[PDB]
Design an enzyme around this catalytic site. Sequence first.
Site, PDB file in Angstrom:
ATOM      1  N   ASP A  51       0.294  12.291   8.110  1.00 50.51           N
ATOM      2  CA  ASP A  51       0.898  11.318   7.173  1.00 50.51           C
ATOM      3  C   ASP A  51       2.210  11.913   6.624  1.00 50.51           C
ATOM      4  OD1 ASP A  51       1.002   8.949   5.698  1.00 50.51           O
ATOM      5  OD2 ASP A  51      -1.256   9.006   4.978  1.00 50.51           O
ATOM      6  N   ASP A  63       0.196   0.517   5.390  1.00 50.65           N
ATOM      7  CA  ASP A  63      -1.284   0.636   5.487  1.00 50.65           C
ATOM      8  C   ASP A  63      -1.925  -0.752   5.494  1.00 50.65           C
ATOM      9  OD1 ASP A  63      -0.567   3.282   5.155  1.00 50.65           O
ATOM     10  OD2 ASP A  63      -1.681   3.544   3.274  1.00 50.65           O
TER      11      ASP A  63
HETATM   12  C1  LIG Z   1      -1.141   7.640   4.620  1.00 49.66           C
HETATM   13  N1  LIG Z   1      -1.459   6.233   2.732  1.00 49.66           N
HETATM   14  C2  LIG Z   1      -1.965   7.477   3.352  1.00 49.66           C
HETATM   15  C3  LIG Z   1      -3.481   7.429   3.566  1.00 49.66           C
HETATM   16  C4  LIG Z   1      -4.145   8.766   3.309  1.00 49.66           C
HETATM   17  O1  LIG Z   1      -3.859   9.242   1.988  1.00 49.66           O
HETATM   18  C5  LIG Z   1      -3.901   6.906   4.946  1.00 49.66           C
HETATM   19  O2  LIG Z   1      -4.076   7.940   5.932  1.00 49.66           O
HETATM   20  C6  LIG Z   1      -2.877   5.951   5.502  1.00 49.66           C
HETATM   21  O3  LIG Z   1      -3.432   5.416   6.707  1.00 49.66           O
HETATM   22  C7  LIG Z   1      -1.597   6.742   5.783  1.00 49.66           C
HETATM   23  O4  LIG Z   1      -0.562   5.818   6.085  1.00 49.66           O
END
Ligand SMILES: *[C@]12N[C@H]1[C@H](CO)[C@H](O)[C@H](O)[C@H]2O
Lengths: 392, 390
Positions: free
Chosen positions: B139, B200
Amino acid sequence: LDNGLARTPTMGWLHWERFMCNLDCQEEPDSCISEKLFMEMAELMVSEGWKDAGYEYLCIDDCWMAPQRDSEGRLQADPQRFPHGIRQLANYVHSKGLKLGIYADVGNKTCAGFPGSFGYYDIDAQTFADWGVDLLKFDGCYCDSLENLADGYKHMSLALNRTGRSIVYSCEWPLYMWPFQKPNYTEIRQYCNHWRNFADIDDSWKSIKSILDWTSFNQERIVDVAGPGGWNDPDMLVIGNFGLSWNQQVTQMALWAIMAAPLFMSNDLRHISPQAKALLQDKDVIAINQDPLGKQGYQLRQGDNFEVWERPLSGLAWAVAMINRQEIGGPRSYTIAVASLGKGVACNPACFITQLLPVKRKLGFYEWTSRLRSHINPTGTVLLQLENTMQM
Amino acid sequence: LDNGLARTPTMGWLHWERFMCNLDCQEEPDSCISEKLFMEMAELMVSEGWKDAGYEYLCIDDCWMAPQRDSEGRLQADPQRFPHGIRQLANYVHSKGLKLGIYADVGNKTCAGFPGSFGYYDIDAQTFADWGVDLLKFDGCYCDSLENLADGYKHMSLALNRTGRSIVYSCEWPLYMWPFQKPNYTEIRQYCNHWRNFADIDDSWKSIKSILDWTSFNQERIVDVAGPGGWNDPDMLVIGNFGLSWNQQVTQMALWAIMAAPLFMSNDLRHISPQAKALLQDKDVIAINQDPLGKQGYQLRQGDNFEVWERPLSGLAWAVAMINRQEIGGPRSYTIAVASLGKGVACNPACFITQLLPVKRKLGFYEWTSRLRSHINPTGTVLLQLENTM
Ligand SMILES: *[C@]12N[C@H]1[C@H](CO)[C@H](O)[C@H](O)[C@H]2O
Ligand SMILES: *[C@@H]1O[C@H](CO)[C@@H](O[C@@H]2O[C@H](CO)[C@@H](O[C@@H]3O[C@H](CO)[C@@H](O)[C@H](O[C@H]4O[C@H](CO)[C@@H](O)[C@H](O)[C@@H]4O)[C@@H]3O)[C@H](O)[C@H]2NC(C)=O)[C@H](O)[C@H]1NC(C)=O
Ligand SMILES: *[C@@H]1O[C@H](CO)[C@@H](O[C@@H]2O[C@H](CO)[C@@H](O[C@@H]3O[C@H](CO)[C@@H](O)[C@H](O[C@H]4O[C@H](CO)[C@@H](O)[C@H](O)[C@@H]4O)[C@@H]3O)[C@H](O)[C@H]2NC(C)=O)[C@H](O)[C@H]1NC(C)=O
Ligand SMILES: *[C@@H]1O[C@H](CO)[C@@H](O[C@@H]2O[C@H](CO)[C@@H](O[C@@H]3O[C@H](CO)[C@@H](O)[C@H](O)[C@@H]3O)[C@H](O)[C@H]2NC(C)=O)[C@H](O)[C@H]1NC(C)=O
Ligand SMILES: *[C@@H]1O[C@H](CO)[C@@H](O[C@@H]2O[C@H](CO)[C@@H](O)[C@H](O)[C@H]2NC(C)=O)[C@H](O)[C@H]1NC(C)=O
Ligand SMILES: *[C@@H]1O[C@H](CO)[C@@H](O)[C@H](O)[C@H]1NC(C)=O
Ligand SMILES: *[C@@H]1O[C@H](CO)[C@@H](O)[C@H](O)[C@H]1NC(C)=O
Ligand SMILES: *[C@]12N[C@H]1[C@H](CO)[C@H](O)[C@H](O)[C@H]2O
C-alpha cells in the site's frame, strides 16, 4: 380525510416502479400496461397469499388511458391495451375480493403526457365512481401555480365525496408544493387519506437512504399530523425487484412499518423469490405497520453510522429499528439501555423483547435497568417488538 | 513483472473489505485480525471447494503487525493475535496446498498506522522471504513525494527478486500517483504482477459502478498493458457480503472476468449463501477470467443506460457482457448485430453463443448477419461466450 377509509395504512400493489409507462405490447407484452397484466396480477394476489396478508388494493398508475377524451368529454381506457374497459376490470377485481385503484393528474396532462383532470374534476370523479374505482392516486404534473394545485386537490376531494362512493384518495399535494412554499399538513389531512412528500422511489439502496434521510430531517413537521384517515406516503415497496440486497430489503420493510407508511408493492408477483415473498407477507411486521393506534414512529438517535428508530404501538408496546449505515466491513454491535427506548415507558418495570427482523427470535425479559445488545448487518436493520410487562 | 508468476490473474482471499482493522479479540474473537481467522479461512478454502475452483492465495491485509519493529529492526507479528508468528502460519497454509499473502506500506506507516517499510525495503523483503510468504500487497500511505513513491515500489520489487523466493508483488503505485501525474503503466508492469488503479472498494453497488466507470474512461491507457505477469487490479470481490443485490453480484463476477482482474474474495467463508458460493465457484466464468491468452476486455459501447463489454479469448472465442445501468423498472431489451462483436471476427461466418450468467443457457448458432437480443435486469449483466464455427 374523514371518509371512514384508511383507518390503518392502505396495503396493495401499484404497477408504476416495476412496469412504468411501457406502451409496447407488440415487442414487450409481459411488461406493457394492459388489462391482462392487472387480471393476471389480481389472480396471483388471491392464489399466492397476498390478499390474506392484507394487500387488498390492485392499483393502476399512469398510462391506462386513450390519448384523448370521448365525444362526451370523459376519459376512456386505451382501446388497444384495455379493450374491455375499466368497468369490466373492476368487476373482475371485485369478483376476487380485491379493490381497484386508478390514477389521474390535477394538472393539464398526466406526468406521462395523457389527459389531465383540470376542467374535468367533477366528470372524472363521477366517471371513476361509475366504473367501480375504490382508490384514486392523483399526481401533480403540468399545474400552473400553488393556487391551481391547491384548488385542484381540494376540488377532486369534494368531487369524489359528491359521488357518495367509498374511494381512497391518494394525493401528491405536499410533493408538488415544496418547489414554491413549505406545505401545510393540517389542510392536506382534511382532504387526503394519504400524501406523497418526496421524489419517486426507484430500485436502489440510494433511493431508500434518500427517503429515510429526508423523513428523519423533516420529522418534526410531518410525524404528528399522521394518524387514522391520513398518512405520510414515502412511496412504493420495491422488495422483490433487482436493486436491493436482502439487508436493504429488510431495511425497507422494517422502516415502512416504523413510519406507518401505506404498503404498495411495485414488483412482478409472477417472478418473486420465496425470501422476498416471506418478508412482504411477514404477519408480525405487517401487524406493526397496521397498529390500530396509528401513531407514526421517528428517528430517536443517529451517530457513528448508526440510526435508532421507534414507533409507539397499542397496549404500551414499541417497535424499535436499528440501522447500520456503514457500507463496509461486517456486522457491528450496538448496545442501548432499554430505559432509553419507548420514552422510558416500554420496559418499566420490564418488557419482553422479540426480534422480528432479520429473523424472528424471542430475546426474553429485560428489567427497566437492562442493556439491549444487538449485531446489525451493513445497510441492514434489526427490528424489535417491546411488550411492557410486570412478569419479571 | 517477469518473475514467472501471475501468468493468469491471481485468485484467492484477502481479509480487508469484510474484516477491516478489528483488533478487539476480547469482545469479538470471531472477527478480529488473528491467526485463528486465517486458519479457519484456510480450512474452508480446502473443505468447501475454493482451492479446487482456483482460489489459492490466503492473504493478510493491514493490522497484522506489532506496533514497533524488533531490536534487530524487523517487522513482527502482533504477539497476542499472531502468537505462533507468520512463518508458522505460512507453514500451516502450505500444508493445505495454499499460498500466503502479507501486507506492507511503501511509506513511513501503513494506512492503519503500523510500521512502514521506507528505509527497511531490503530487510522487509528478506523477512517476508524467510517467513515463506508467497505474495506481498504494498500500500502507498504516508509517502511524502512521487520520487519516494516510484523509488520505493521499484526498490521493493528488486529486493523481493533478490531474496530468491517466488513472491507475487501487488502494488498501489498508480492509485497513489494518479492525483499528481499520469502513471507510466509500461514502467509499473516492469516492476509489478498487479497494480491498484482506483479507490478502495465498499460493500455497495455505488462502489462497483464507480470502479467500472473509472476503468471504461481510462481504457485507452490501461487495457493493452495488461497480460500474463501483469494485471490491472480493480480491488476485491465483495460477493457473499451485505451491500449487493444478486444482480449486482452477477455484475461484479461477470465484469471482473471481462477485465482479467485478480479475483480476491473478501467475505466470511464460514457464513456465505449457497447462491454466492456457486457464483464465485462458477467454473465457466472463472475459465474466462483465467483465459491463458491474458488479453484484458474493454467497453465496446455505452448508451441508453446500457453498456456492452467484450474480451478476446483463446481459440477464436469471445466473452460479451451486457449491463443494464437503469435502476428503475424491469428487465430491459437490448439487441446488437453479432457482426459488431469481437471486431467482426467472433461470428464470421457464424458463432455458437452460450449464456453463462445470470444462468447457463445454450442460445444456439448465430450467422454473421444475425442480431443478439437479450433482456437485462436493472443493475444486472448478461455474460455470453461466443465460439467461432471455423
Ligand atoms: C490501502 N487503504 C489501505 C488498506 C489497508 O490499510 C487496504 O489494504 C486497501 O485495500 C489499500 O488500498
Ligand atoms: C363525505 O364527507 C363527509 C364529511 O366529512 C363524510 O362524513 C363523515 O364520515 C365519517 C365516517 O363515516 C363519519 O364518522 C362516523 O361517525 C359515526 C357516528 O358518530 C360512527 O359510527 C363511525 O364510527 C366508526 O369508526 C369508529 C372509530 O373511529 C368505530 O368505533 C366504529 O366501529 C365505526 O367503524 C364514524 O366515526 C362522520 O360522522 C361523517 N361526518 C359528517 C360531517 O357527516 C362522508 O363519509 C363523506 N362521504 C364520502 C362517500 O366520501
Ligand atoms: C528475478 O528477476 C528475473 C529477471 O526477470 C526473473 O527472471 C525471469 O524468470 C522467468 C521465470 O522463470 C523466465 O521466463 C521463464 O523461463 C523458464 C526457465 O527456462 C521457462 O521454463 C518459462 O517458461 C514457462 O512458460 C512456458 C509458456 O511459454 C511453459 O511452456 C513452460 O512450461 C514454463 O512454465 C519462462 O520462459 C524469464 O525469462 C527470466 N528472465 C531473465 C531476464 O532471466 C526471475 O524469475 C526473478 N526471480 C525471482 C525469484 O523473482
Ligand atoms: C519518512 O519520515 C522522514 C522523517 O520525517 C522523512 O525524511 C525527511 O524528508 C524530507 C523530504 O520531504 C526532508 O526535508 C527536506 O530538506 C531539504 C533540505 O536538505 C529541503 O530542501 C527539502 O525541501 C525538504 O524540506 C528531510 O530532510 C527528511 N529527513 C530525513 C531524516 O531524512 C521521509 O521523507 C519520510 N518518508 C516518506 C516516504 O514519506
Ligand atoms: C393550515 O391550514 C389549516 C386548514 O386550512 C388552517 O386551520 C384553520 O384555519 C381557518 C382559517 O384559515 C380557521 O377557520 C380554523 O380555525 C383553522 N383550524 C382548523 C379548521 O382546524 C391553519 O390556519 C393553517 N396553519 C397555518 C400555520 O397557517
Ligand atoms: C391548462 O391550460 C389552459 C390553456 O392554456 C390554461 O388557461 C390553464 O391555466 C391550465 N390549467 C392548469 C391547471 O395548469
Ligand atoms: C515509460 O516507461 C518505459 C519503461 O521504463 C520507458 O522505456 C518509456 O520511455 C516511458 N515512457 C514515457 C512516455 O515516459
Ligand atoms: C407521478 N412521476 C409520476 C408517475 C406517473 O407518471 C408516478 O405516479 C409517480 O409515483 C408520481 O410521483
